[model samples]
Target: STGSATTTPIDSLDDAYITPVQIGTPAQTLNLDFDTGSSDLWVFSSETTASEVDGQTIYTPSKSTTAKLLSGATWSISYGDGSSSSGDVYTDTVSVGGLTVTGQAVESAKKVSSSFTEDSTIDGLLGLAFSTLNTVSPTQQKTFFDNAKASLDSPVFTADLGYHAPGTYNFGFIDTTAYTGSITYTAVSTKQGFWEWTSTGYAVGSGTFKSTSIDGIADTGTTLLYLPATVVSAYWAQVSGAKSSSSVGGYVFPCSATLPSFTFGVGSARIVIPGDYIDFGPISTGSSSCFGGIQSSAGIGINIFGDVALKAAFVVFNGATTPTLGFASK
Candidate 1:
C-alpha cells in the first residue's frame, strides 16, 4: 500500500532550450523564448492590469492589428524569483524562422512586473518544458509541440549558437548543419521544470578546478556561468588588456583582439568557447573598459554553463530517450 509507481525524474539538462518563436502577424511581430521548462505560450498584452506591469514585458494588442482574444482561459504564473503575473488567453499565427503555425494558443499577461514588463523586447515564452510546471493543463490546454507535433518533419529539434549574434534555437526538426558527429540522445525524466543534476566541478583554460562538472545537466536557464572564483580569475587572466566595467556586469575586452580560446570537456567531448564570446559588453564609464562574461557567483552553489557558453555549441535534449544532452557542431 505504501508503494506507488514513481515517475522518473525529468532530466532538466536534457530539456529543450528553445529560441524565440514569433507570434501575431505582419504589423506586430512578437518573439518568445521557447522553453521545455513549462507548457504554455504566454505574451504581454495591452489589456493587462497595471499592477502586473512592474518588471514584465507588455504586448499591446492594439499594436497587433491581427491579434484576437480567447475570452475564457486567463492565467497567472509565479516564478522561483518571487515574480508573478496574470493575463487572458488569445490565439494568433505563430511563426519560427520560415515556418508559421496558425491559431496558436497564447496567454496575454495583463499584470506584470518591471522586469517582465520590459520583456516586450520579445513576445513571450513558448513553454515546452514539462507538464508538471505547465501553466496550462492537458485537459484545458495543449503545448505548441502538441499542436505542431503532426506537422513536425522530424522526431526532434536542435539548437545552434552564433558567435556574436543571438543563437539559433530551432524546432520541428534537427538540422545536421548545426551539429558535428552523430547525435547522442538521452531519455528525459519527469522532474520539475528546472534542470537539475550533480557536477564534477569546473575547468578553466588548461587548469582544472576543485568542483564537479555536470556533463549534460548544465544549462542556459541562467545568464552567466556560475564558475568557481579561482576558475573565473584564471580564465580572465589570459585575456590581455581585458577590463571590467562599472555599469554593465560581466567582463569585456577590445573587439579586435586575437584572444586565446578555451574548451570545456564534458566526459569525452570538449565544448570550445571563442575569445570573442568572452567580450560580453563595452564599458560605460572607464576608457577601454568592457563587461566580461565570466563573472563571480560566489554565493551560488551550483556552476551553471548559462547562455554564453550554450551559444557556442549545438545542444540537444533527448526527452524521448534518456534524459541526456547531445552536443552538435554549429
Candidate 2:
C-alpha cells in the first residue's frame, strides 16, 4: 500500500523511443514526453525549422505516410520556464498498443530551442497528463483527453510509471486488477487546474497530527514534495539534535535519521510518504551527508506534492471525463 515509484522527466535519447498505445488501432506507436504539466501529443519533424530543440524528440511527418495535418488552426505554447513554440495543426493515423485513434492532434513548432536540436534520436513528446495548464484554442478543445475520450477504452485511464527504470512511462486503461480496489474520486477546486489538496494529517516518526492541516498539490512532473514553510520548519524542529545537511542542492535536512510517515487522504485512499523520500539524494553544497527528497520552498506556493507522494498510491487524472481526479493503492 506504501512504496516508492521513481520517474524521470523524459528527455531525448539516441535510439528511437516507442510506446504502444490504443489510439484507435490496436497497437499505434508514438513518441512521448514534452509535458509542460498538461496533456497534448507533439512530435518533432523535418518541417520544424526551430533554431534549437534540446531534449526534444523530433517526429518527421513525412516518415508517416498515413498522417494528415489539420489545416486552418494555429497553435503556440509557452512554459513557466519562459520557453515558447508555435506551429500549425496536423492529424496522424496513430496507434498504440492494440488501440487506434485516427486524426490525432499534432503540433509543429515554428521555433524551438537549441537544446532540442543536438539530439537526433528524439522525434517528439506525448503529453498524456492533465489539461489544467493547457495552452490551446477555445481552451475547451485544448487536450488529447478532450478529443480522445469518445475513442479511448474507458472514461478512466492510468499512467503506469516506475517500470523499465525511471523514464519508462506507459498510458491507457489502468488495470483495475493491478490496483487494490475501485478508484477514489476527489473534487478539484474550479480555480484553474492547480489540483490543490490537503493532507488527512501529519506526524513525525509516525507520531501524531498536531491539530493542524497541511494543503498541497499532487504533481507527477515534480520530483520533490514541497512542504509549507511552517510544516518544513516543524519537521526539522524535531531533529534539532542532528547536524543539518543539504541534498540535490534543493532540500536541507539532518544527516541521516528515520523520517516520520505523512499521509494525505483522497476520499478513502490514503497516500503515505516515508522518511526516505524526504532525504532523496546528496547535495553539491559539499554536505556529503545531505541528500535529496525534502527541499526548501520557503517563499514558494503553500505546498506541492511531487511524484514521491504520487508513487505512494494509484493517482489518476480523470481529465477525459472532467476536471475531477481519482486515487487508490494496490
Candidate 3:
C-alpha cells in the first residue's frame, strides 16, 4: 500500500536526479532521470537504432519473458525544446521505488536526438506528469503513478529533495518527520498536464512578500527556477555584474557576486532558498563567471519552479479527482 526509495542527487545537486527503475520479467535495471514534467515510461532499448546507442544502457525486450509488443500502438513526444523522441509501445512489468505495476505501457525508443545519446547519465526518463500528456496514438495510456494509485493506501506521493544530498520519494503517504510546520495546500490545474498552481507571489531575500498571483509549475525534471522578467531582474539587480546574456544561455554573474536568499509564498507559507544554492557554482570549472539558479521565463511565458525551487521544500503531489499540491518547509 506504500512504497519508498532514495536517490542520491550527489556531487551536482543542480544537475539531474537519477533513480533506479526495474523493467520486464528478467528484471533489467536502468538509472533514469526521475522527471515530474512528462508522463511516459520510455526507455533506451533494443528497439533504438544501433547508431543512437552510445555507452548508455539499453533494454532488451527479447530477453524478457513477459515483454509483449503492443500491436497497434505507437508514440511520439516532443519536449519544451524542439528536440524529440518517438517510438513504439510495449506492455511489461514496471517497478519504481518498490511500487510495482503489472502490464505497464513502456515506450521503447526507436529514435532519439543526439542530446539523449551524448549524455549517458540517464539511460532514459520516467515521467511523472499527468496521463493526459501521454503521446500514445489511437489508445493513450495511463502513467505508472496512475496505475499504481488504485493499489496504494492513498493516492499521494511526496518528494524530499535534499540540498547536495540524497532525496527520497515516498508513495501513498506523507512522512511527518520529513517536514516541519503545517503544509500549505493549493489546488492544481492539470489542464495543461502539469502540476500547475498559482503562488502567493515572492520576496527577494528578507523583503516583504508581494501578495500577487504568480502562476507556475512544480517540475522536478528541470534544473533551474524560472520566473517573470520583472521578478528575475529584481533579484539579479541586487547583485553587481549580473546580466541576461544569450551567449552563456540565460543569466550569469561574477562568482564572487553577493546572492540573497529567495523566498516564494505558497498559500501563507514562505519557502526560502538559501543564497548559497543560487551561486550554482561556476559557469565553467574554475571559471570566475557563475550562473544564477533562477532565470527569466519570458521566452516560455510560464514560470517554472524547477528543482532549484522544489529542493527548498518538501512537496506532495496528491492524485485526487481534483489534484492538489502540498508544500512545507523541510
Candidate 4:
C-alpha cells in the first residue's frame, strides 16, 4: 500500500522535520522526528520521568491493551549533539499515514537529555535507517519502514523538505508530480546503517566542477549540511566576509554578505543549492554574523547531507533488497 505524511519544520531555520504517527490500540497520535540517520523507533512515554517530559506527548502502555512489553529488551542512543535517550521496549500496533504494522517495537523512553526536554515540538524519533543499527538488545527490532516494507507497493520512501513550510514523506510510491526532471539514481551503502552515497563531485556556484568524489549520508534528522573541510572552505570563499569562527563554531560570515550557491553532481544531474539557503540565522540576537548551512564534518568523522542539502532536492530512500538512492530536481 502507498501512504503519505506531512513533514513540518519545527523552526524558522527549518532545523528539523516532524511527522504525525499513530501508536497503540486507541491510536494515540504523537509528533515524531523521522530520522534517516539513526535506526530506532522511540517515544516520550508514560515511563519517562516528569522532569524530562516537558510538553511532549507521552505514549501510555497502561492505556493500550495492544501494548506488550518486550521483556529483557532495552535501547539507548546518544546523538552527535551529545543528547541521549534510553528506555525499555514494547510491541504495539503502529501507523504512519495509511501504512500500519502490528507488533512493531515501540521503545518507551525512561530518560532523556535536557536538549530534548527543552525542545517541545519533537515527541520522539522514528528512525528510517537500516535495522542493523537498532540499539535494542538482546534482540534487534526492525524499524517502522523495515517492518512495513514487504507490504509497501514499492519498497521505498521519498523526502520532500520545504523552506519554512510543510513538506511531505511518501511511502511505497514515488509522486512524479512532486518534482521535475528525470531522477538520477545512485548506489547506496548501508554498511554503516545509513542512506550513504558518494557524489560524483561538487562545484562552487557556476564554477568548474571538482572531480573529487565526496561520500556522505542523507540525514533528514540533522539540521545542517556537513562536508569535507576543503569543499566547505571553497564554497565560503566565494561569499564576501566569510570566515571560520571558533567562538561560534564551524563557519560564520556577515549576514549581509553576498553568498554563492553550492552545486553537487549525482551521476549526470547537477543539484544547485541557492545562495540564500546558506545564510543561516544570526549567531546571536541582533548580531550581524550568521552561521552557514554548509559546515566541516571533520569533528563528526562522517559527512552528512542534512536538511540543508535535502531541502534542495527530492530524495528517494529506496528499501529494495539492493538499496539505492534517487535524486530529482524540484
Which tens-of-lDDT digit does each residue in 168-202 have in candidate 1?
A: 65555566766667654333334544444433445
Off by over 4 Å in 4: none
C-alpha local distance difference test of each model: 0.56, 0.53, 0.87, 0.93
Candidate 2 residue runs with Cα over 4 Å from true position: 1-31, 34-36, 48-56, 81-85, 113-125, 128-132, 137-141, 163-174, 181-183, 194-198, 210-216, 238-249, 254-260, 285-291, 296-302, 319-323
TM-score of every model versus the real structure: 0.68, 0.72, 0.97, 0.98
**Which candidate number has the best lDDT?**
4
* Better structure of 1 and 3 per TM-score: 3
Clashes of 1: 54
When 3 and 4 are scored with lDDT, the better candidate is 4
Alpha carbon lDDT at 263, candidate 3: 95
Please write out the lDDT profile of model 4 over residues 20-87, one tens digit for every residue: 99999999999999999999999999999998988999999989989999999999999988899999
**Model 1, stretches more than 4 Å misplaced?**
1-28, 35-39, 49-72, 78-84, 91-93, 98-104, 136-142, 182-190, 195-202, 207-211, 215-221, 228-260, 283-289, 296-302, 321-323
lDDT for 67 in candidate 3 is: 93
Error of 2 at 67 (Å): 3.0
Worst 10 residues of 2 by lDDT: 1-10
Sorted by lDDT (best first), the order is: 4, 3, 1, 2
Ordering by TM-score = 4, 3, 2, 1
Tens-place lDDT per residue, model 3, 1-330, is: 887878667247457777888999889998777778899888999989989989888898899999999999999888775557889999999888888899999899999998888767778888889999989988999888899999999999888887888898888999999999999999899989999999998899888878888999989888889999999999998888999889888899888877999999998889999887787878888999998999998989778999889999999999988899999998
Whole-structure CA lDDT of model 3: 0.87
TM-score of 3: 0.97
Better of 1 and 4 by TM-score: 4
For candidate 1, which ten residues in a row score worst on lDDT? Answer: 1-10
Instruction: Predict model 4's lDDT versus the native.
Output: 0.93
